[PDB]
Amino acid sequence: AQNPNCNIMIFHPTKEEFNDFDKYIAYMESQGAHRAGLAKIIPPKEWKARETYDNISEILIATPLQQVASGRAGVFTQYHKKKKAMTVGEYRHLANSKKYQTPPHQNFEDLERKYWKNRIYNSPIYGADISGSLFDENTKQWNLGHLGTIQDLLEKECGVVIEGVNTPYLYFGMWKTTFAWHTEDMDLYSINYLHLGEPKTWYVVPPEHGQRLERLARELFPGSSRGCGAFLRHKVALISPTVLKENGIPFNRITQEAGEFMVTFPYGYHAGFNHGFNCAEAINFATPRWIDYGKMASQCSCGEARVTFSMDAFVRILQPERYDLWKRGQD
Ligand SMILES: O=C(O)CNC(=O)C(=O)O
Ligand SMILES: [Mg+2]
Ligand code: NI
Ligand SMILES: [Zn+2]
Known part of the structure; x- marks a missing residue:
């Protein structure tokens, strides 16, 4: 068995290996990367996501979230308090302000220590979950807006066409x-x-x-x-x-x-x-190996988790026994 201690693996694909996204995921798994739960991929030196980031300040963060903690320093929950809209330029200025800026530190381990010691005593503001992309349309490799869709994967594996x-x-x-x-x-x-x-x-x-x-x-x-x-x-x-x-x-x-x-x-x-x-930019994706995990995934039906439109079909097809209860949680 590859990677039996479940260590996080770091990959350095060549530009040729960066062409075929599905093939590279399957390669990483052949080397045991999935056993860790997480892998890092350093793109080839020839690649870029876009030309510059000089023109992003006018993106709107419609609902910035203030993350308020409760508990003790190592065991806490956070709730999200909605704040008034602001642009990325306004949010960057706020992040850099004396109230919110990173403290002086020696290295990443010192900063990690300071995070865990002090996080609960502050309420930072996160611009999360904003639909959109910063990849140039001309970036053909690992462009997170051009991936094969999860609905197409489910249809390829299982034969069922679904909305979403x-x-x-x-x-x-x-x-x-x-x-x-x-x-x-x-x-x-x-x-x-x-x-x-x-x-x-x-x-x-x-x-x-x-x-x-x-x-x-x-x-x-x-x-x-x-x-x-x-x-x-x-x-x-x-x-x-x-x-x-x-x-x-x-x-x-x-x-x-x-x-x-x-x-x-x-x-x-x-x-x-x-x-x-x-x-950061992020998206969910699937491979053939995911299907079994999707069939076994837990679900929240208490009403709290509330999720996207497209999860309906995944529950309905992969988990038909759970569907009625889960959908009640959504409504
Ligand atoms: O970057 C974040 O705040 C959270 N991202 C993720 O959980 C992810 O990419 O899966
Ligand atoms: Mg802009
Ligand atoms: Ni995540
Ligand atoms: Zn719940």
């Missing part, structure tokens, strides 16, 4: 903005490109060990667990690396820098934080 669409999302971050512990909708893959700015640190649990994280989460968040049998689908719970180590949960960590891709694999729990002002 699959488009990318932009994320504008600042220091301390946080992504809570989660797997993707329907335990899909994700791919995330850091277009510009400061890094993003990731934590990940190997897919084969995801239920260990779920059992810890039920212990640490006992009211939430009584409320919902899949409350990590709410995307609000944080657990620090120190607490994971104290409870024996297997995990790994890595920092993504501008110009780098990350891929999350089916049922790879992940969480993380931004170092400073940045912009």
